[PDB]
Amino acid sequence: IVGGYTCGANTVPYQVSLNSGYHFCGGSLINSQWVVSAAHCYKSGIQVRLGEDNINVVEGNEQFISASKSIVHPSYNSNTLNNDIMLIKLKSAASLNSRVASISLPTSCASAGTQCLISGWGNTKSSGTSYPDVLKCLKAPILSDSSCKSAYPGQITSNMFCAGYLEGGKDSCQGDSGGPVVCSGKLQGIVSWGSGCAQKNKPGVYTKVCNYVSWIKQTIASN
Numbered sequence: 688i689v690g691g692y693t694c695g696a697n698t699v700p701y702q703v704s705l706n707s708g709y710h711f712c713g714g715s716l717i718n719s720q721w722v723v724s725a726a727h728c729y730k731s732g733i734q735v736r737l738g739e740d741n742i743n744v745v746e747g748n749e750q751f752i753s754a755s756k757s758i759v760h761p762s763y764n765s766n767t768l769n770n771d772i773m774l775i776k777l778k779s780a781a782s783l784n785s786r787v788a789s790i791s792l793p794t795s796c797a798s799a800g801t802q803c804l805i806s807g808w809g810n811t812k813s814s815g816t817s818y819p820d821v822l823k824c825l826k827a828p829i830l831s832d833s834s835c836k837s838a839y840p841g842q843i844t845s846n847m848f849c850a851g852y853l854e855g856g857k858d859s860c861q862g863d864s865g866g867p868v869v870c871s872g873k874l875q876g877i878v879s880w881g882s883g884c885a886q887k888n889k890p891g892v893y894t895k896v897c898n899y900v901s902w903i904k905q906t907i908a909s910n
C-alpha cells in the first residue's frame with residue numbers, strides 16, 4: 688500500500704496473509720473454514736496466517752492453518768485476469784474472536800463514490816521497494832467505470848472495477864494482491880492488478896465480488 692497508514696494491530700480482523708515460507712498474498716476470511724483471495728495468488732502448499740499484524744514477529748494473536756484445498760474460478764483467464772478470484776478451505780476451522788473475524792459478502796454491488804478500506808503488507812513506494820512488516824491501510828473511493836476504462840482501454844470487463852485516486856499518490860501495490868476492499872461493511876473487491884503503483888491516471892483494478900456471491904456460496908456449501 689502506497690500513501691496509506693498503519694492500521695493498528697488487529698483492526699482489520701478478517702485480513703489474512705497467505706504464506707508459502709514467506710508472505711506472498713493477502714486474503715479475506717469469510718467464515719471459520721474459508722478464505723477468498725485472487726486466483727493469480729494460486730500456489731500449491733499454502734499456510735493461511737490469521738490474526739497477524741507484524742508478519743515477522745509472533746505477537747500472540749496468530750493462528751497458522753494449512754489449506755486443505757484451493758478452488759480457482761472456473762473461468763479465470765490468467766492473460767486478462769478476468770474472474771480473478773479463488774477460494775481456499777482451511778484444514779481446521781479457525782477460532783473466531785475479536786482479533787480474527789470473518790467479513791460479510793455483499794447483497795448488492797456498490798456505487799462509484801463509495802469509500803472503501805484496502806489493506807495489506809505490500810510495497811509502500813511508487814518508485815522503489817520497501818516492504819513493511821505491519822499491516823497498512825488505505826481509504827479510497829470506487830471510481831466511475833468510465834474513468835477506469837479510459838485508463839485501461841480494452842482491458843476492463845464487468846467483473847472489475849477501479850478504486851483510488853487519478854492524481855496518483857495513494858494505491859494498493861504488489862504484495863497486497865488477493866487482499867480485501869471493504870465498503871460499507873461488505874467485501875466488494877479483491878486487489879487484482881494495476882499499472883505500477885500510485886501513478887497518475889493508473890488507478891488500481893479490483894475483482895468485483897458482488898458478481899460472484901452465488902458461485903462462492905454454492906462452492907463452499909459443496910466442499
Ligand SMILES: [Ca+2]
Pocket residue numbers: 739740741742743744745746749
Ligand atoms: Ca506476527
Ligand SMILES: [Mg+2]
Pocket residue numbers: 712713714806807808862863864865866867878
Ligand atoms: Mg492484502
